[PDB]
Amino acid sequence: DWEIPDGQITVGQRIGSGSFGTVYKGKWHGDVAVKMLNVTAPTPQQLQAFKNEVGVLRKTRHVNILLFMGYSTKPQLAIVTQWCEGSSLYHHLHIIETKFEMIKLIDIARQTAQGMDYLHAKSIIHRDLKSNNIFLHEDLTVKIGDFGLATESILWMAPEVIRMQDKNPYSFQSDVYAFGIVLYELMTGQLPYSNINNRDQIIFMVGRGYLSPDLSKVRSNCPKAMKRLMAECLKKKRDERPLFPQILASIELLARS
Amino acid sequence: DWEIPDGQITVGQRIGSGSFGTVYKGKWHGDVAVKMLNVTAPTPQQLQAFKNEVGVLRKTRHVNILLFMGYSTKPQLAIVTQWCEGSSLYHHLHIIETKFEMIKLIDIARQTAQGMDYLHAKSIIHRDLKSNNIFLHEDLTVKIGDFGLATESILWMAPEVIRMQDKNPYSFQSDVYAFGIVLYELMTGQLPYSNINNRDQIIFMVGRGYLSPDLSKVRSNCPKAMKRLMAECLKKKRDERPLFPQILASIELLARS
Numbered sequence A, B: 001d002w003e004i005p006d007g008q009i010t011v012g013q014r015i016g017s018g019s020f021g022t023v024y025k026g027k028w029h030g031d032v033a034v035k036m037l038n039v040t041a042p043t044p045q046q047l048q049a050f051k052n053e054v055g056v057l058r059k060t061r062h063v064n065i066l067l068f069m070g071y072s073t074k075p076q077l078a079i080v081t082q083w084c085e086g087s088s089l090y091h092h093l094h095i096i097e098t099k100f101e102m103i104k105l106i107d108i109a110r111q112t113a114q115g116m117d118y119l120h121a122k123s124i125i126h127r128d129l130k131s132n133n134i135f136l137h138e139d140l141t142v143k144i145g146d147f148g149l150a151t152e153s154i155l156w157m158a159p160e161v162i163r164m165q166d167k168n169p170y171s172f173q174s175d176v177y178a179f180g181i182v183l184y185e186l187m188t189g190q191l192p193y194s195n196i197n198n199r200d201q202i203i204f205m206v207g208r209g210y211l212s213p214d215l216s217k218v219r220s221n222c223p224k225a226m227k228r229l230m231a232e233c234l235k236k237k238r239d240e241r242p243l244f245p246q247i248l249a250s251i252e253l254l255a256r257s
């Protein structure tokens, strides 16, 4: 059992926000990230969202999934994980403009695919894969986190997820789409749709297939096979998109170069 | 459930000989380490050993503990952990004589201690802590492995363990003593009793109180507080040995210098 008795966890600095709560740097047998819900009266919807996340996290054990360490129910609801020093991929690529070399980029892509595979093989769909939830531990190791919207943001959401025509538009291919946006971030160093200033228009056009990411913006030393892989993972039609084994095989084969 | 379904684990080249099994490099959602029972049919004592080890590992979720990924029963009894890219601490210190700076040595000491502290707070006694079950990984991160003898190699063995003339000869302090030997290795670059070439005699003389590690052999840049800490962790009477929270407090303090 993974309940952590109160009084053990030391909450320090507020780092930011997560899915269903607030992120703090903490102390519990060392540094730990803590996502905590600042709420005196935890509504039953909240409990559920919490129960589910914990439930999913217990089922994960892999270097590329942010290591779940336990949970707390008092004084508030909390999830505890390993601390990753470094920052999110979003932070590296778009805030402090870190310039990685291509080999490092592909490695980030491989690792990111490595963990997504694990997740799916364990019949888990993330539903919220983006460069913010990918944490770059010691600037070497990839850690996918935030399994709040998980089940067993606009730019990374596939067209079918935007339309919400189906009952449940999420699938393994929806995460694949998201991951392809990550490859786009990796290889362009940029955010898609940067020449559009209007969120609504983006949402509407992606949903209708009018809009798609401009792959001509990749670095000149991005392998052709990697642009191809991007475009497979980015296909507007769900069933035309690769699954992670194929994606992995692809990147690993691309790697020798 | 952590039972890996038959087939998925691919075993590669043999790495060395672990505890109650053999260790191979592997593949199962990325590189992994595999410890497998290199036998055909298991004696029912070999079998509950495996059970127990899996029972301890599935209670470990911490960055300084080698990450359990799963177990298999078919083909054979096997344990899957994360693969660590570096090597054993042992290997660095006494084979390739890696020249770490003090800061890094102290860091390794803290991490190792951080891990040992995690265990003991969950009532786990390792019983085989040596620099060979300390795997470095991206050379910054420490991973304590091999829970073959874990419950709830003589150079790291406390004198009361050597004698086997008590209740439970093993204790938190038996572990603390073994950790003291690791500090020694960090601070000397070498094993204790290196000028003695007979295993039986060392057993006899540590058991009797005739032999103890020579602390004059430490670095000149080794802080007095580490030497002093080492000598408390190495005290023959176990009730005079600090526990890990104190050990941590000591190291974090002298690390602020």
Ligand SMILES: OCCn1cc(-c2ccc3c(c2)CC/C3=N\O)c(-c2ccncc2)n1
Pocket: A015, A016, A017, A018, A019, A023, A033, A034, A035, A053, A066, A079, A080, A081, A082, A083, A084, A085, A088, A132, A133, A135, A145, A146, A147, A148
């Ligand atoms: O990206 C915005 C800033 N930021 C958010 C987090 C974060 C996000 C989600 C979750 C946790 C931490 C912990 C548990 C969790 N979800 O369950 C982190 C972080 C993650 C790992 N180590 C250090 C910091 N940084």
Ligand SMILES: OCCn1cc(-c2ccc3c(c2)CC/C3=N\O)c(-c2ccncc2)n1
Pocket: B015, B016, B017, B018, B019, B023, B033, B034, B035, B053, B066, B079, B080, B081, B082, B083, B084, B085, B088, B132, B133, B135, B145, B146, B147, B148
């Ligand atoms: O020290 C002897 C050489 N050596 C032994 C192991 C090892 C030892 C025990 C166990 C595992 C691997 C996996 C399962 C286990 N115990 O349950 C390793 C190793 C560990 C992690 N990554 C790479 C290599 N090197």
Ligand SMILES: [Cl-]
Pocket: A063, A141, B063, B141
């Ligand atoms: Cl790690």
